[PDB]
Design a protein around this ligand. Structure first.
Ligand SMILES: Nc1ncnc2c1ncn2[C@@H]1O[C@H](COP(=O)(O)OP(=O)(O)OP(=O)(O)O)[C@@H](O)[C@H]1O
Lengths: 758, 723
């Protein structure tokens, strides 16, 4: 923090400090954190080193502070540093939000925020009782040394403590009997350092009360400071043992054998710090009276070394042990006032995403008034640093937070992260509302984004992985429910308008921006939603009512995409195909199975009553609502005929590459939803697709690739192989033997190609 | 009769008292520590509710709850076809409950009034927050079908509302079950207050009830009666609109810690002589249950008290957490289930080791198949297994190759050999000893250190006990048990300057123990113990010592002789000391005086004769012992001194010094301490005992007809014998 150093000197001190702290044992750095706590938010020139130290040591202790056990050898968190670190995160975040955008400083501080947010347990209960009476010596604005103690003149010692006072003054007179004997002084008329003649041989009982008061005054001040801190003192029967029991040589007493407890040790550490603060006040008055100079011990007590700590430590020890021997029971300063643990609001993630959704809604309304004023000539941003801070810190902050807490956000104490630490139902509701806000923030603003639209699509991807449908439905605020419904409906409508403008714009300005927005954000994020929902099994139950007709619309649009053919469609075809495969898994109806669609009672087409058939606008048939989609057996006739065809990947690629991921993503889930895989309602259940039929489809695809080798093939069938190792695993190993093993030897012939064959 | 003590579900058998019986080696079910059987003592514990006061809402609706419970009687007795009358006799079918609470006995009316009050109060103490929803839910009442059969005689119509549209949340139903359990506990407690005790049959003369059982063991019929009554009551309370927002499902972690005594795991291993230094070896571990089990290979220096794989002696595999253990724990393999068979393999030449689960090779976090990458041959490896609480396992050394289940699919091709592939005899199996024994304090002990102070011209020889753990963490704040290695023999028959003739004819011996200042005296006990003392409790008290009073009487029944036997004859220093906390300045020399000719144990403390005295039985072997919980680095010290007219301890202990008044401390005498680090040998063969029920007429027959004998090596000094 000193400024007289050269640039090279600053570099050397920074490297040395970051190394020592880097290999330093994690628990020991608590005092250094709490000294850094108030200096970090300044964000001065000196602050880059605190930011880097914060980043590196928190990234090192990513496991430690999150795990309730931490690292077993290094223990776990104390929650005092956790309360300090939440203040760190909030101070840094709010300061950076309100103060001017510097590119270097805020790309350096962003990883610091990420590390702090990750290390802080999202499940953490902000206790109503937190660290208080904050030691202010480190809170001096300059030189972090203002050693004012807690004033205690107002309080007064009570009457039962007078016997304690007499006994402890007896102990003091005894240890100075030993002190005078040790340095050599003996009884005489008057006190003399010359001949070691020294008249205090007389007992405590008859000692003069003035000379007794010389012993009181330190004892009196110590007891007053003890009482002002609030420590409850309780009286035991060992004390009246003394009363029933009731010059001289104070005869050998044995101090050292007794020992204290750890809570009393922290208690005594703070009392010793208080005594050092009183000593440092006295030294400050004497130094100001002097007018100049410095003292080696002028540094705060935490900055001190053990040798000077020894005097305070021992003199606190002695009074404490004599207090046990006297029988008093010292406790903490004040009882707990209340517990904020019942409320899920005090959960750290809850407040974090609280101010996060306020900031996100603020950014969304700022971009709304920018859509309004962007037709004006002035393109300047009054909220420039607001939105740049948002997009390049908050959005990365959200991304890193949800990545670090993959399982936490999925955790509802219902076995996801069964160790504990569940994201609350309201927290997951407000996660879904954050997803909705991100979507409505990203609708048709790619050009307005300064290429950070890729960051935003990754944000939407991550928020798509972080979802919990059961929790949202069984417990969900109606506003958030409507937000998600309007989300899905608006996404479907956006795709329907892009489908209609692509039929009318079959031949291939603002329409280019719209289609690029679609293919870069909307299709990938819907695909991510679809992948997450299907993989995490909540597809069927996220899809109950009118969300089914929304997904029917999305299916019609997606199949129109699959049947649409252009050069830009070919360029963005991989995203299209992955969207197709994702939605097939998400979609709950065997829409291919034209004959066996209707009978499933689990569908809207069965729950649809009759009055609200007529209320809605429906083609009245599961096939008339989707006229273009073909019947499953007809597509499988198509698949077999393309087996005997073996069409080329550069001659006839469209149908043959669009349909294969479709069917694979279908049967991957509707095999285990097939008639043999569901023993209940067999051949009457959702589907009829079976192991022999998919095995024929395997041999079929692997027969087309045989002809496809002539044109050196393409990567998307390697993507199919990626899709199909799950297929190979979930197919019975008996079908592997004698059919798929000859396929391994046939593909052993195919090993001539440079590409890696499975 | 003793058959009346059988719990209703279990059937009476006659088993072996000990766990292990005579059977095949590979079928022998190795057993871990058993769960403590605390359910035998069914103490009905009620949740305390007297401290809680009714909130104002419940206070103003108390009258409506009284009306509701009156409606409950007048529906229950009328829904069962029952009618009304003064005496509650079931044969004439008369009950006053169908009539108004006024004619109904006010005492039972109020009894049910407040037991419904503490019903809602137990809901409150359980976190059930019974508050009114709205005044609608009280102003509206539905009307039930009230035929003549369902008709009542009181004005309180039993037609509040049909409970079909009212649903009780699943957690609320579970708490209803809990409160029904609480009501059953209240009933059982009242019966205990009257003195009722459980019996399989029902009696009123002996006044015994089979209904006096925990709710889990209660019969389904009474379960359903109480269930329907209390569920209907809570449902009607909800119908009154006082909705109760159910307290959360607070998940409970039983922590599986209920083992009898401090034993957490039982370690089984083969004999140290079968250690392997070379070759490929294989053996199978069959898991009867799934839980805290570890199997692997251990060195001959494995400690029976430490858990396998915590330190270097053992290389074990824990599938419960799916972790390999050697000086630590790293993720390895998967978790097994009940019936899964683990196959352990070792290569002593390639220095590799790996495991199998039902045949497949377990994989590390990396793709490598080696459980432990490399190690040193050292002194060889031996098969080992540790079993947790309520765990059953089987170890097959492969003496019969056919008995190995997965050896053919894995292990045979690789060239691994069964551990007992070429053995004519079964492998002797050693286990961790349950019962602690006294042994000499090791010089390398991490907490206890003993120094021997030679006797000077003015000081008697002393043995000083110190703790090196103090002043540092890991210091064990547990009561250590100490004793001297050599006993005093009391006379075979009991008779019915100090003088150098009295001192030569006397048989009274003395040792003293000085408690060092700063060591808390009430934490230290001094006296004598016998060879039978095998009790290791973290908390020790003189009231807990094992005692028995054998009384032998003449032919009428007069007690002509009473003998009290105990293994511990010791006193506390805190009670012996008079000045209390004002002392601890110096001293506290407790003196123990033993009269070998009369068996009188007298204790002196700071020159005064203590009140406590013990009279022992002839030929008792007494070991000088001191039990202390160390609160100071220096805790107590044996002083082998003497007082006036009292023989020294060495004279009693040794025979060559029988007439030597000078105190001595020969090297044989040394401090011994109680510990659990000892192995026990399972016998190769057990007695052939068969047990069966001959008939109801004849009972259970047990029969042993084969004689087995074993050599017992008797250590003379310690008065114990081992095989
Ligand atoms: N109709 C009723 N039948 C039984 N008990 C009733 C009835 N009405 C009120 N009670 C009350 O419930 C109590 C329980 O009576 P119950 O016939 O169940 O006896 P018990 O306690 O199970 O008997 P035991 O201890 O002899 O097995 C009675 O003592 C009485 O206070």
């Amino acid at each position: 923090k000193g400024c007289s150093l050269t640039k090279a000197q600053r570099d050397s001190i920074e490297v040395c400090l970051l190394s020592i702290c880097g290999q330093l044992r994690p628990s020991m750095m608590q005092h250094l954190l709490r000294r850094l706590v108030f200096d970090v938010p300044l964000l001065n020139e000196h602050a880059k080193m605190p930011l880097k130290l914060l980043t590196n040591h928190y990234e090192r202790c990513w496991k430690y502070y999150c795990l309730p056990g931490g690292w077993g050898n290094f223990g776990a968190a104390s929650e005092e540093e956790l309360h300090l670190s939440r203040k760190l995160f909030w101070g840094i975040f709010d300061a950076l939000s309100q103060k001017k955008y510097e590119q270097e400083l805020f790309k350096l501080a962003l990883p610091c925020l990420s590390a702090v947010a990750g290390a802080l347990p999202p499940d953490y209960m902000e206790s109503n009782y937190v660290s208080m009476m904050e030691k202010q010596s480190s809170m001096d604005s300059e030189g972090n040394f203002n050693p004012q103690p807690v004033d205690t003149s107002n309080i007064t010692i009570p009457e039962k403590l007078e016997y304690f006072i007499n006994k402890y003054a007896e102990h003091s007179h005894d240890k100075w009997s030993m002190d005078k004997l040790a340095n050599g002084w003996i009884y005489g008329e008057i006190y003399s350092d010359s001949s070691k003649v020294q008249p205090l041989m007389k007992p405590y009982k008859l000692l003069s009360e003035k000379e007794k008061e010389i012993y009181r005054w330190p004892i009196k001040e110590s007891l007053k400071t003890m009482l002002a801190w609030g420590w409850r003192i309780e009286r035991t029967r060992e004390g009246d043992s003394m009363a029933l029991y009731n010059g001289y040589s104070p005869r050998a007493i044995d101090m050292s054998n007794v020992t204290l407890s750890r809570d009393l040790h922290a208690m005594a550490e703070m009392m010793a710090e208080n005594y050092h603060n009183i000593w440092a006040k006295k030294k400050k008055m004497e130094l100001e009276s002097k007018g100049g100079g410095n003292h080696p011990l002028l540094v705060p007590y935490d900055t001190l070394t053990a040798k000077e700590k020894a005097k305070d430590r021992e003199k606190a020890q002695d009074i404490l042990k004599f207090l046990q021997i006297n029988g008093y029971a010292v406790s903490r300063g004040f009882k707990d006032l209340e517990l904020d643990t019942p409320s899920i609001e005090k959960r750290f993630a809850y407040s974090f995403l609280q101010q996060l959704i306020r900031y996100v809604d603020e950014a969304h309304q700022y971009i709304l008034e920018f859509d309004g004023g962007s037709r004006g000539k002035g393109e300047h941003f009054p909220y420039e640093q607001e939105i740049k801070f948002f997009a390049k810190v908050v959005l990365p902050l959200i991304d890193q937070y949800f990545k670090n807490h993959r399982l936490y956000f999925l955790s509802a104490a219902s076995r996801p992260l069964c160790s504990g630490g569940h994201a609350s139902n309201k927290e997951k509701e407000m996660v879904t509302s954050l997803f909705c806000k991100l979507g409505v923030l990203v609708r048709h603003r790619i050009s307005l984004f300064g290429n950070d639209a890729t960051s935003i699509v990754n944000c939407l991807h991550i928020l798509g992985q972080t979802l919990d449908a059961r929790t949202v439905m069984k417990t969900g605020l109606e506003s958030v429910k409507s937000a998600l419904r309007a989300f899905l409906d608006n996404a479907a409508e956006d795709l329907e308008k892009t489908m209609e403008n692509l039929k009318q714009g079959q031949f291939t300005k603002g329409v280019t921006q719209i289609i690029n927005y679609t293919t870069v954000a909307l299709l990938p994020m819907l695909s991510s939603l679809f992948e997450h929902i299907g993989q995490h099994q909540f597809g069927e139950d996220l899809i109950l009512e009118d969300v089914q007709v929304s997904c029917y619309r999305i299916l019609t649009s997606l199949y129109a995409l699959g049947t649409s053919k252009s050069i830009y469609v070919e360029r963005q075809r991989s995203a299209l195909g992955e969207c197709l495969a994702a939605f097939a898994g998400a979609f709950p109806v065997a829409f291919l199975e034209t004959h066996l669609d209707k009978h499933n009672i689990y569908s809207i087409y069965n729950t649809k009553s009759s009055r609200e058939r007529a209320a809605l606008s429906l083609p009245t048939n599961v096939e008339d609502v989707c006229p273009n989609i073909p019947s499953l057996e007809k597509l499988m006739e198509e698949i077999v005929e393309l087996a005997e065809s073996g069409i080329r990947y550069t001659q006839m690629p469209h149908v043959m590459e669009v349909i294969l991921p479709m069917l694979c993503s279908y049967m991957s889930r509707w095999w285990e939803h097939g008639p043999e895989n569901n023993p209940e309602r067999a051949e009457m259940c959702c589907t009829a697709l079976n192991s022999e039929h998919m095995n024929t489809l395997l041999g079929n695809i692997l027969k087309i690739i045989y002809n496809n080798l002539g044109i050196d093939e393409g990567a998307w069938m390697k993507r199919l192989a990626v899709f199909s190792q799950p297929i190979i695993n979930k197919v019975k190993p008996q079908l592997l033997k004698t059919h798929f093993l000859p396929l391994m030897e046939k593909l052993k012939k195919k090993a001539a190609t440079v590409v890696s064959e499975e | 009769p003793c058959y009346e003590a059988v719990l209703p579900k279990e059937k009476l058998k006659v088993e072996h008292s000990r766990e292990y019986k005579q059977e095949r080696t590979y079928t022998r079910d190795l057993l871990g520590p058993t769960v403590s059987l605390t359910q035998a003592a069914f103490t009905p514990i009620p949740v305390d509710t007297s401290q809680i006061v009714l909130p104002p809402h419940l206070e103003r609706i108390r009258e409506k709850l009284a009306e509701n419970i009156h409606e409950l009687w007048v529906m229950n007795k009328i829904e069962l076809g029952w009618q009304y009358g003064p005496v509650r006799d079931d044969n004439k079918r008369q009950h006053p409950c169908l009539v108004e609470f006024s004619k109904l006995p006010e005492q039972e009316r109020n009894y049910n009034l407040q037991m419904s009050l503490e019903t809602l109060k137990t809901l409150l103490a359980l976190g059930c927050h019974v508050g009114i929803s709205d005044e609608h839910a009280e102003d509206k009442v539905k009307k039930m079908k009230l035929p003549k059969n369902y008709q009542l005689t009181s004005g309180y119509k039993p037609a509040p509302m049909d409970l079909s549209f009212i649903k009780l949340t699943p957690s609320q139903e579970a708490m209803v079950d809990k409160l029904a359990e609480n009501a059953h506990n209240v009933w059982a407690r009242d019966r205990i207050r009257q003195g009722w005790t459980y019996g399989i049959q029902q009696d009123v003369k002996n006044r015994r009830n089979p209904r006096l059982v925990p709710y889990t063991l209660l019969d389904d019929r009474t379960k359903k009666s109480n269930k329907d009554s209390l569920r209907e009551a809570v449902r009607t309370l909800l119908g009154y609109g006082y909705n109760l927002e159910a307290p959360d499902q607070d998940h409970a972690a039983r922590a599986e810690v209920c083992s009898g005594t401090g034993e957490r795991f039982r370690i089984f291993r083969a004999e140290k002589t079968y250690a392997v230094k070379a070759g490929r070896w294989y053996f199978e571990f069959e898991t009867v249950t799934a839980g805290d089990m570890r199997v692997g290979w251990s060195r001959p220096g494995c400690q029976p008290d430490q858990e396998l794989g915590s330190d270097e002696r053992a290389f074990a595999f824990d599938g419960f957490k799916a972790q390999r253990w050697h000086q630590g724990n790293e993720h390895y393999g998967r978790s097994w289930q009940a019936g899964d068979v683990v196959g352990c393999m070792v290569d002593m030449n390639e220095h590799t080791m790996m495991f199998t689960l039902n045949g497949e090779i377990l994989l590390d976090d990396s793709g490598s198949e080696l459980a432990f990458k490399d190690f040193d041959v050292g002194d060889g490896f031996i098969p080992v297994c540790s079993l947790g609480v309520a765990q059953v396992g089987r170890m097959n050394f492969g003496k019969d190759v056919s008995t190995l289940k997965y050896f053919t699919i894995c292990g045979l091709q690789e060239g691994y050999e069964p551990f007992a592939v070429n053995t004519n005899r079964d492998i002797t199996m050693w286990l961790s000893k349950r019962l602690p024994q006294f042994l000499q304090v090791p010089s390398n002990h991490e907490h206890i250190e003993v120094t021997r102070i030679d006797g000077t011209i003015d000081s008697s020889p002393c043995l000083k006990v110190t703790q090196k753990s103090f002043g540092s963490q890991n210091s064990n704040t547990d009561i250590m048990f100490y004793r001297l290695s050599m006993p005093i023999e009391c006379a075979e028959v009991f008779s019915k300057r100090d003088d150098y003739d009295f001192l030569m004819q006397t048989s009274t011996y003395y040792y003293s123990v000085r408690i060092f200042p700063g060591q808390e005296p009430a934490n230290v006990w001094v006296g004598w113990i016998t060879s039978d003392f095998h009790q290791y409790d973290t908390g020790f008290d003189l009231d807990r010592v094992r005692t028995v009073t054998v009384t032998l009487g003449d032919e009428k029944g007069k007690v002509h002789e009473s003998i009290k036997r105990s293994n511990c004859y010791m006193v506390c220093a805190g009670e012996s000391m008079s000045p209390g906390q004002g002392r601890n300045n110096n001293g506290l020399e407790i003196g123990c005086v033993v009269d070998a000719a009369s068996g009188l144990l007298t204790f002196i403390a700071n020159g005064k004769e203590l009140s406590t005295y013990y009279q022992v039985e002839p030929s008792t072997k007494l070991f000088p012992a001191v039990f202390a919980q160390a609160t100071s680095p220096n805790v107590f010290q044996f002083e082998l001194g003497r007082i006036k007219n009292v023989m020294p301890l060495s004279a009693g202990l040794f025979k060559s010094e029988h007439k030597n008044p000078v105190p001595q401390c020969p090297p044989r005498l040394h401090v011994q301490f109680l510990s659990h680090v000892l192995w026990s040998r399972m016998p190769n063969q057990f007695l052939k005992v068969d047990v069966s029920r001959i008939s109801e007429r004849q009972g259970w027959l047990v029969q042993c007809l084969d004689p087995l004998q074993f050599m017992s090596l008797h250590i003379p000094e310690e008065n114990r014998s081992v095989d």
